[PDB]
Write an enzyme that holds these catalytic residues in place. Structure first.
Site, PDB file in Angstrom:
ATOM      1  N   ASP E  43      -2.981  10.857 -22.992  1.00  0.00           N
ATOM      2  CA  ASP E  43      -4.100  11.034 -23.902  1.00  0.00           C
ATOM      3  C   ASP E  43      -4.553   9.664 -24.412  1.00  0.00           C
ATOM      4  O   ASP E  43      -3.868   8.652 -24.244  1.00  0.00           O
ATOM      5  CB  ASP E  43      -3.691  11.977 -25.043  1.00  0.00           C
ATOM      6  CG  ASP E  43      -4.834  12.326 -25.989  1.00  0.00           C
ATOM      7  OD1 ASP E  43      -5.726  11.491 -26.231  1.00  0.00           O
ATOM      8  OD2 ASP E  43      -4.829  13.461 -26.507  1.00  0.00           O
TER       9      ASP E  43
HETATM   10  C1  LIG Z   1      -1.823   2.883 -44.682  1.00  0.00           C
HETATM   11  C2  LIG Z   1      -3.265   3.330 -44.461  1.00  0.00           C
HETATM   12  C3  LIG Z   1      -3.372   4.831 -44.200  1.00  0.00           C
HETATM   13  C4  LIG Z   1      -4.757   5.224 -43.694  1.00  0.00           C
HETATM   14  C5  LIG Z   1      -4.902   6.729 -43.483  1.00  0.00           C
HETATM   15  C6  LIG Z   1      -6.261   7.095 -42.893  1.00  0.00           C
HETATM   16  C7  LIG Z   1      -6.420   8.599 -42.694  1.00  0.00           C
HETATM   17  C8  LIG Z   1      -5.426   9.163 -41.682  1.00  0.00           C
HETATM   18  C9  LIG Z   1      -5.699  10.633 -41.370  1.00  0.00           C
HETATM   19  C10 LIG Z   1      -6.907  10.818 -40.454  1.00  0.00           C
HETATM   20  C11 LIG Z   1      -7.457  12.240 -40.503  1.00  0.00           C
HETATM   21  C12 LIG Z   1      -8.099  12.657 -39.181  1.00  0.00           C
HETATM   22  O1  LIG Z   1      -7.415  12.974 -38.267  1.00  0.00           O
HETATM   23  S1  LIG Z   1      -9.903  12.671 -38.999  1.00  0.00           S
HETATM   24  C13 LIG Z   1     -10.334  13.682 -37.554  1.00  0.00           C
HETATM   25  C14 LIG Z   1     -11.615  13.152 -36.917  1.00  0.00           C
HETATM   26  N1  LIG Z   1     -12.237  14.169 -36.088  1.00  0.00           N
HETATM   27  C15 LIG Z   1     -11.687  14.476 -34.779  1.00  0.00           C
HETATM   28  O2  LIG Z   1     -10.734  13.895 -34.385  1.00  0.00           O
HETATM   29  C16 LIG Z   1     -12.341  15.539 -33.900  1.00  0.00           C
HETATM   30  C17 LIG Z   1     -12.488  15.216 -32.417  1.00  0.00           C
HETATM   31  N2  LIG Z   1     -11.511  14.208 -32.042  1.00  0.00           N
HETATM   32  C18 LIG Z   1     -11.725  13.383 -30.869  1.00  0.00           C
HETATM   33  O3  LIG Z   1     -12.704  13.527 -30.217  1.00  0.00           O
HETATM   34  C19 LIG Z   1     -10.696  12.320 -30.481  1.00  0.00           C
HETATM   35  O4  LIG Z   1     -11.259  11.462 -29.532  1.00  0.00           O
HETATM   36  C20 LIG Z   1      -9.439  12.954 -29.886  1.00  0.00           C
HETATM   37  C21 LIG Z   1      -9.792  14.257 -29.170  1.00  0.00           C
HETATM   38  C22 LIG Z   1      -8.438  13.231 -31.004  1.00  0.00           C
HETATM   39  C23 LIG Z   1      -8.821  11.989 -28.877  1.00  0.00           C
HETATM   40  O5  LIG Z   1      -9.737  11.810 -27.835  1.00  0.00           O
HETATM   41  P1  LIG Z   1      -9.214  11.184 -26.403  1.00  0.00           P
HETATM   42  O6  LIG Z   1      -8.560  12.274 -25.590  1.00  0.00           O
HETATM   43  O7  LIG Z   1     -10.396  10.638 -25.638  1.00  0.00           O
HETATM   44  O8  LIG Z   1      -8.226  10.071 -26.655  1.00  0.00           O
END
Ligand SMILES: CCCCCCCCCCCC(=O)SCCNC(=O)CCNC(=O)[C@H](O)C(C)(C)COP(=O)(O)O
Ligand SMILES: CCCCCCCCCCCCCCCCCC(=O)OC[C@H](COP(=O)([O-])OCC(O)COP(=O)([O-])OC[C@@H](COC(=O)CCCCCCCCCCCCCCCCC)OC(=O)CCCCCCCCCCCCCCCCC)OC(=O)CCCCCCCCCCCCCCCCC
Ligand SMILES: CCCCCCCCCCCCCCCCC[C@@H](O)O[C@H](CO[C@H](O)CCCCCCCCCCCCCCC)COP(=O)(O)OCC[N+](C)(C)C
Ligand SMILES: CCCCCCCC/C=C\CCCCCCCC(=O)OC[C@H](COP(=O)(O)OCCN)OC(=O)CCCCCCC/C=C\CCCCCCCC
Ligand SMILES: CCCCCCCC/C=C\CCCCCCCC(=O)O[C@H](COC(=O)CCCCCCC/C=C/CCCCCCCC)COP(=O)(O)OCCN
Lengths: 178, 124, 128, 70, 88, 84, 55, 459, 103
Positions: E43
């Site tokens: 992935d």
């Molecule tokens: C110390 C600092 C801490 C910071 C924390 C920041 C926040 C952390 C938590 C984040 C919350 C989330 O997940 S926010 C979630 C954002 N929305 C999505 O992920 C929906 C669709 N995802 C995709 O399309 C991606 O590409 C995917 C399929 C995953 C991979 O694709 P590949 O197959 O092409 O690799």
């Protein structure tokens, strides 16, 4: 760096960039290896609970709130590699990079030393001299009307041809010239 | 600290302010009034040219320590008895200073008690 | 529910916190495409002028000359006397002068008065 | 100016006996000096002259009259 | 410094060494020309984790624009060699 | 003169989670239903000469034994030489 | 050993009316004590630099 | 004094009779010989002066200026040797003739026992400089610059002439000796106020004073290298020399008439030092630095104390040398870049290390690093102003800091950093440029050994 | 995601050319052709040409030129203690007044 940029970044690219930044700042926060591995797996899991989100208007709200969270806990003194744009030795050897054309200004007494290197230097200069004349025509014929859209250059397509605009990329001084 | 806490949290009047000490005559305590004795004269103390802050009642032991240090230079730790005597004389001077502090404090306490008793008697 | 970041003039707002890098519209994508197109045109022109082996000089940048001319030799022809300009010029060109004049005049008047009355202790003030 | 030491790539680097014995000797001399100075000169940390108690002084030496003479 | 002049063989060996310690990839099936999501079924998050693992391995960090298109061990080796100016 | 001796990489199968605090990380992750795939890549930090650690107080008292022995023998020699 | 102190005014630079500026060196306690410490530290740092800055 | 004036005059027939490929050698050699001869005037005496004749006399204020003027010409010839290569022989001879005429006028101006002759030569210096600026100037603005450089000056000095003759109608003489010995105070009157203004504004404009300095950036930017040398080094000191000569009759009015000029100079030093911080041109930066230094010298002259005069003289000499060297370095960079912009040429210490060393030394000298004569004049003027008023130091201190800033900025933007990739016409520095730099910088470090040679008559 | 075929081809060609150039940057065994032409002991000579001569020059300069003028070298007068003897005069300095010594 070596790759040309695009007009915009897709949602996938932004998600990957946020994931990499979060991992880097987490390992900056978690100094030790076992603690970092545990918390990195935990954060990958919490980042993975919304992989299969389908609607784009909801997946963009998740990353938008993830960028508000990362900023709050971003470790105002992160770890930076020494040669990175923020590292302690970023441009340490930048003053030792002397251009190749400077060798054209050497005195004949200095060029008496190192004869083979200079012979190879005129060989390279002649090669470039014909190659550039070929590349002007190649790049003029391959460009689309109205000008290029992205700054990506085509390779060489014939046998004896060389990639257009190659002289200043292959003749980089060195990583650590001195 | 205890004196600092007592002065800055209780009454300021009962304990002295070290800038204006002393506030009572030296002859108030006892009449014999023995004077302090110096053994180092003007000329020899000036010739030793110790320091202005070092020209105190403890001068002779400092002069002896300097003399023994100059006499036996290569083995620097040769004279330690003289250093101990100078330190003891400084300690005695500091004890005298603390005795002056406590004496002034007790004189002021006695004066305050006498004034309070006189005021109470005059009130009736 | 985290504290919010407030951008300032000397501490701007991060790109990832931009509320305009999400509400994306096809017009925004078209604008980005045109920006990339003109940037690529300029880059191609510079690279064509840069890798030429027959060039033995400096590649003249019209942007640099235009910037220098705008900063130096174009200020006056576009100048118009306006209340804002007039007040700012009067302030920045007159106020400091009178302020320093008043300060130095007061100091020297006090010094001269102390000379005349006589208590200043000018001993050893030989070289002046 | 030294000897040839090879890289390890995830193993403990080569150590010569000279540097180990030198570091151990220097630490031993440091601790021996600390102990020797503490033994020979112990008043530099604890003091030599006791701190007098202001309350233990009697009024005879402090010029205090029993609140009646004056 | 006294740092040895690392070569292409050393770079490839270290790349394969890092890849084999990643238990999500079968050690007996991985090859120098093996693709990530196709030959190994990985992935994108695993790809960026491999990128960061190599980043820590070699002491330098690859920009995201170049990292998100390094898909084979051979081209990762070639990218590192081009970055470090390796002769042979 | 440079360090050119053709150093070969060690075998990759010796690196194991066993005997390392990565065991605790793996147990804590499995208790929730997760696994750490990069555990073995950091095994070398707990395998060889890095297996044993020293405390802060132990680090401070690096040469306490030899210094104490030297102090004892020196004070004994002083006692046996002064008494004459 | 003695407590030797000295000031050396060897070269007279210029006389501005009643003020004489000359190359004067002070050799009091502070100077003669701080010269050896600085020189020893500089010697150690240079010997360190011969190895640190070889490249 | 004729033993130096006559060879300067004979420089003209020698140049006009020389071969088409040997004019530069003859001019340089004979100019250096004339400078060696003029070094004899440096042997001043604590007594009155070296009164050669009724027309010419030398003082310890005139002697260093004369030596500097004689020494400047060979440097200007070496600087102009390059950009006049493709010039016809007649026009090169005309250029050398203009330079020789300017030196002759300056030499006759610096002795000038009589004040009207001093004024006549003071204005005679205006013609060759104008011709040089307007004829051999690269850009199109030169003409306008020349106009400015003319009219400002004349606007300052046309009243002075009237004042001068008025004095001779009352005093009866304009000989500086008789003027000094028969000095009488100026009463507090409107007529005396306007006479003071007429006498002072003539030399204020050429120094220049803040607010009257608009001609100077134009004149220095648009002029050729030799013109910039002569304007920055010697032609700026004419105002200071004139003020120190003419303030002998303005007392005690100056004690209250110097307030506007003191305020203007003490604020304009800060204003120009801050202007130097944000400048897209090297020549403009050097010109504004010159304005700041001359404003400090104006403050010193207006204070009118012995330390003020000593510091003013030393600062004039040091500033002339430093500004000449800085202009030479800027011209050497320009002759390769052909752009005259600070940020186009960068990272030059990688390509020209000795030129980088020369830049560092020139910046340090401008930065007033002890024990240079620059800082000698700086400290003398600062202490004199402190005696004048204890608050002035504040402004002075600010100026010093700002000075260093822009100086190092000029050193950092042009020399440090990464070189410009698309500039491949940076040839190694010639022996001529390095010799010019050495001949500029060595006299400064040799004069710092014997400061009394440039401290003036009040030493 | 990943390289396009044109990108791969251009990268491969550019790296081949870069490797050829970098290999060409090396030196032959005779490459630095130097043209020859001529026209305790180390510490012993160093201590003479770098220490002894400056000592001689400065001692001469201070003894015969610096001290030729008054007040150039001024020495703080030596400390004087009871019981000392002055070389110039020979008289003995009176001692202390036998202060009571007890602990
Ligand atoms: C110390 C600092 C801490 C910071 C924390 C920041 C926040 C952390 C938590 C984040 C919350 C989330 O997940 S926010 C979630 C954002 N929305 C999505 O992920 C929906 C669709 N995802 C995709 O399309 C991606 O590409 C995917 C399929 C995953 C991979 O694709 P590949 O197959 O092409 O690799
Ligand atoms: C400390 C005293 C030393 C005395 C020993 C004798 C020294 C004689 C020097 C005379 C002047 C130098 C000539 C200037 C241009 C240099 C020529 C050149 O091209 O260099 C290449 C040349 C060969 O190198 P290269 O590899 O071929 O060239 C490659 C590049 O050039 C790359 O070049 P680079 O990277 O090597 O750098 C060039 C170098 C050289 O370039 C310079 O910048 C040197 C000039 C520094 C002065 C800056 C102006 C400020 C005003 C100071 C005025 C002092 C003058 C005094 C009288 C001098 C008489 C002429 O720059 C520096 O080293 C940095 C200088 C900053 C020093 C700041 C401290 C100044 C005050 C110190 C006290 C002075 C008075 C003492 C009074 C009390 C004690 C008695 O190198 C040298 O020759 C360097 C010379 C030594 C540096 C001198 C610095 C301090 C000495 C100042 C004068 C001595 C005072 C007298 C007291 C003695 C006791
Ligand atoms: C622009 C770049 C700089 C150029 C030069 C600028 C400096 C020029 C200023 C010249 C000096 C000041 C001018 C007048 C000085 C006289 C003293 C006056 O300031 O003090 C008061 C005088 O008050 C008023 O100034 C009186 C005159 C008022 C009318 C003059 C116009 C003032 C503003 C004009 C500004 C225009 C500037 C540009 C001119 C082209 C005290 O009054 P009083 O003690 O009783 O009389 C003093 C004179 N006595 C003793 C001979 C009798
Ligand atoms: C090494 C070369 C010498 C070889 C052997 C000779 C040894 C010395 C014998 C020479 C004769 C003695 C001699 O040097 O003469 C003294 C002679 C001058 O004679 P005076 O008239 O007494 O002094 C001037 C005031 N009237 O002194 C000298 O010039 C030499 C020593 C000068 C000191 C060194 C100066 C270095 C610093 C340069 C100036 C820096 C700025 C000024 C300092 C600022 C301090 C406020
Ligand atoms: C860069 C621009 C600078 C321009 C010059 C600025 C200074 C101008 C100063 C005035 C110029 C002329 C002054 C006269 C020369 C001195 C002669 C003198 O003092 O004699 C006076 C004459 O005084 C005058 O005539 C002065 C009148 C002024 C006429 C010209 C006015 C010019 C503008 C005045 C305002 C400018 C002042 C500030 C200028 C600031 C700088 C721009 C006394 O005459 P008597 O009749 O013999 O004695 C009377 C008792 N029996």
């Amino acid at each position: 760096a070596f790759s040309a940029p695009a007009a915009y970044l897709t949602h996938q690219q932004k998600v990957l960039r946020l994931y990499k930044r979060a991992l880097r700042h987490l390992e900056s926060w978690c100094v030790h290896r076992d603690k970092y591995r545990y918390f990195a797996c935990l954060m990958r899991a919490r980042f993975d609970e919304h992989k299969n989100e389908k609607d784009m208007v909801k997946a963009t709200q998740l990353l938008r709130q993830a960028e508000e969270e990362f900023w709050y806990g971003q470790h105002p003194q992160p770890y930076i590699f020494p040669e990175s744009p923020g590292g302690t030795s970023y441009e340490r050897y930048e003053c030792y990079k002397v251009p190749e054309w400077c060798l054209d200004d050497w005195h004949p007494s200095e060029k008496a030393m190192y004869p083979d290197y200079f012979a190879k230097r005129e060989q390279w200069k002649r090669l470039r001299r014909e190659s550039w004349e070929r590349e002007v025509k190649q790049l003029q014929e391959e460009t689309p009307p109205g000008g290029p859209r992205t700054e990506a250059l085509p390779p060489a397509r014939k046998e004896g041809d060389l990639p257009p605009l190659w002289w200043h990329i292959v003749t980089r001084p060195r990583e650590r010239p001195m | 600290g205890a004196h600092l806490a007592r002065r800055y949290l209780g009454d300021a009047s009962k304990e002295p302010d070290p800038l204006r000490m002393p506030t009572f005559p030296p002859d108030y305590g006892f009449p014999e009034r023995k004077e302090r004795e110096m053994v180092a004269t003007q000329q020899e103390m000036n010739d030793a040219q110790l320091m202005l802050q070092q020209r105190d009642y403890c001068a002779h032991y400092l002069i002896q320590l300097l003399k023994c240090k100059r006499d036996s230079f290569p083995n620097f730790l040769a004279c330690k008895h003289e250093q101990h005597d100078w330190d003891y004389c400084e300690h005695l001077d500091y004890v005298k200073r603390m005795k002056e502090f406590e004496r002034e404090r007790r004189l002021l306490q006695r004066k305050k008690r006498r004034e309070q008793r006189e005021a109470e008697m005059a009130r009736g | 529910s985290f504290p919010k970041y407030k951008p300032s003039r000397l501490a701007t707002l991060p790109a990832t916190l931009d509320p305009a890098e999400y509400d994306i519209s096809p017009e925004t994508r078209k604008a980005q495409a045109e920006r990339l197109a003109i940037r690529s045109r300029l880059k191609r022109e510079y690279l064509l002028q840069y890798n030429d082996p027959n060039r033995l000089g400096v590649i003249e940048d019209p942007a640099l000359i235009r910037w220098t001319y705008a900063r130096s030799a174009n200020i006056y022809p576009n100048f118009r006397p306006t209340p804002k300009t007039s007040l700012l010029g009067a302030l920045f060109g007159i106020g400091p002068l009178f302020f320093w004049y008043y300060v130095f005049k007061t100091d020297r008047d006090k010094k001269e008065k102390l000379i005349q009355e006589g208590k200043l202790d000018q001993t050893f003030n030989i070289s002046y | 100016g030294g000897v040839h030491i090879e890289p390890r790539y995830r193993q403990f680097p080569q150590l010569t006996r000279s540097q180990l014995i030198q570091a151990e000797f220097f630490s031993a001399t440091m601790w021996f000096w600390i102990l020797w100075r503490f033994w020979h000169d112990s008043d530099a940390v604890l003091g030599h002259f006791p701190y007098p108690d202001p309350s233990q002084w009697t009024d005879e030496e402090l010029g205090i009259l029993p609140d009646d003479e004056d | 410094s006294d740092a040895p002049p690392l070569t292409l063989e050393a770079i490839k060996d270290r790349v394969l060494y890092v890849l084999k310690l990643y238990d999500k990839i079968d050690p007996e099936k991985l090859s120098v020309n093996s693709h990530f999501m196709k030959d190994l079924g990985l992935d994108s998050l695993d790809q960026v984790e491999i990128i960061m693992a190599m980043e820590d391995e070699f002491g330098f960090e690859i920009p995201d624009i170049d990292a998100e298109k390094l898909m084979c061990p051979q081209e990762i080796v070639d990218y590192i060699a081009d970055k470090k100016d390796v002769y042979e | 003169e440079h360090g050119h001796s053709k150093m070969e990489l060690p075998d990759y199968k010796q690196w194991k989670i066993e005997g390392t605090p990565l065991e605790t990380v793996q147990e804590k992750l499995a208790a929730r239903g997760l696994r750490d795939p990069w555990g073995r890549n950091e095994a070398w930090r707990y395998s060889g000469g890095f297996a044993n650690n020293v405390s802060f107080v132990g680090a401070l008292l690096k040469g306490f034994k030899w210094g104490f022995a030297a102090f004892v023998v020196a004070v004994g020699a002083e006692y046996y030489l002064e008494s004459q | 050993h003695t407590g030797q102190e000295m000031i050396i005014s060897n070269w007279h630079w210029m006389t501005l009316q009643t003020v004489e500026l000359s190359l004067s060196f002070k050799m009091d306690y502070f100077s003669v004590m701080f010269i050896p410490v600085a020189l020893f530290v500089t010697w150690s740092i240079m010997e360190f630099s011969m190895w640190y800055m070889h490249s | 004094m004729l033993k130096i004036i006559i060879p300067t005059t004979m420089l003209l027939p020698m140049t006009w009779m020389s071969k088409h490929n040997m004019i530069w050698i003859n001019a340089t050699v004979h100019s250096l010989l004339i400078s060696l001869i003029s070094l004899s005037l440096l042997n001043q005496l604590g007594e009155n002066s070296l009164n050669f004749s009724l027309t010419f006399f030398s003082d310890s204020l005139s002697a260093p200026l004369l030596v500097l003027t004689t020494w400047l010409l060979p440097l200007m010839l070496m600087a102009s040797q390059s950009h006049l290569s493709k010039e016809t022989t007649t026009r090169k001879k005309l250029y050398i003739t203009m330079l020789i005429l300017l030196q002759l006028f300056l030499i006759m101006t610096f002795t000038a026992t009589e004040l009207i002759l001093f004024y006549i030569l003071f204005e005679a210096t205006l013609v060759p400089t104008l011709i040089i600026i307007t004829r051999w100037g690269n850009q199109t603005e030169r003409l306008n610059a020349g106009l400015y450089f003319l009219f400002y000056t004349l606007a300052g000095s046309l009243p002075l002439l009237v004042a001068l003759v008025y004095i001779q109608n009352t005093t009866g003489s304009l000989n500086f000796l008789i003027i000094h010995y028969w000095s009488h105070p100026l009463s507090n009157s409107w007529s005396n106020i306007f006479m003071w203004l007429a006498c002072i504004m003539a030399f204020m404009v050429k120094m220049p004073l803040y607010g009257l300095h608009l001609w100077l950036p134009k004149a220095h930017v648009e002029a050729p290298i030799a013109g910039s040398m002569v304007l920055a080094a010697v032609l700026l000191k004419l105002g200071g020399y004139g003020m120190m000569r003419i303030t002998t009759i303005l007392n005690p009015l100056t004690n209250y008439m110097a307030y506007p000029f003191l305020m203007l100079s003490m604020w304009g030093m800060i204003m120009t030092s801050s202007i130097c911080l944000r400048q897209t041109d090297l020549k403009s930066l050097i010109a504004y630095s010159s304005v700041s230094h001359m404003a400090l010298v104006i403050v010193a002259i207006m204070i009118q104390t012995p330390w003020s005069f000593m510091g003013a003289t030393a600062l004039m000499i040091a500033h002339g040398l430093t500004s000449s060297m800085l202009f030479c370095l800027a011209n050497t960079n320009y002759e390769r870049v052909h752009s005259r912009t600070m940020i186009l040429a960068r990272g030059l210490q990688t390509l020209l290390p000795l030129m980088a060393t020369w830049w560092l030394v020139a910046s340090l000298t401008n930065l007033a690093l002890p024990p240079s004569i620059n800082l000698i004049g700086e400290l003398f003027i600062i202490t004199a102003s402190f005696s004048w008023s204890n608050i002035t130091i504040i402004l002075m201190g600010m100026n010093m800091m700002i000075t260093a800033l822009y100086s190092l900025y000029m050193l950092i933007t042009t020399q440090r950093g990464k070189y410009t990739h698309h500039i491949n016409n940076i040839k190694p520095s010639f022996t001529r440029e390095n010799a010019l730099m050495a001949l500029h910088i060595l006299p400064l470090l040799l004069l710092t050994l014997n400061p009394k040679m440039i401290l003036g008559p009040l030493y | 995601s990943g390289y396009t075929p044109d990108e791969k081809l251009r990268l491969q060609q550019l790296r081949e050319l870069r490797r050829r150039w970098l290999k060409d940057q090396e030196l032959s065994p005779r490459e630095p052709v130097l043209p020859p032409r001529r026209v305790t002991y180390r510490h012993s000579i160093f201590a003479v040409t770098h220490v002894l001569i400056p000592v001689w020059i400065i001692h001469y300069y201070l003894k015969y030129h610096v001290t030729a003028k008054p007040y150039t070298v001024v020495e703080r007068k030596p400390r004087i203690f009871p019981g000392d003897t002055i070389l110039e005069t020979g008289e003995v300095i009176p001692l202390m007044k036998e202060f009571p010594d007890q602990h």
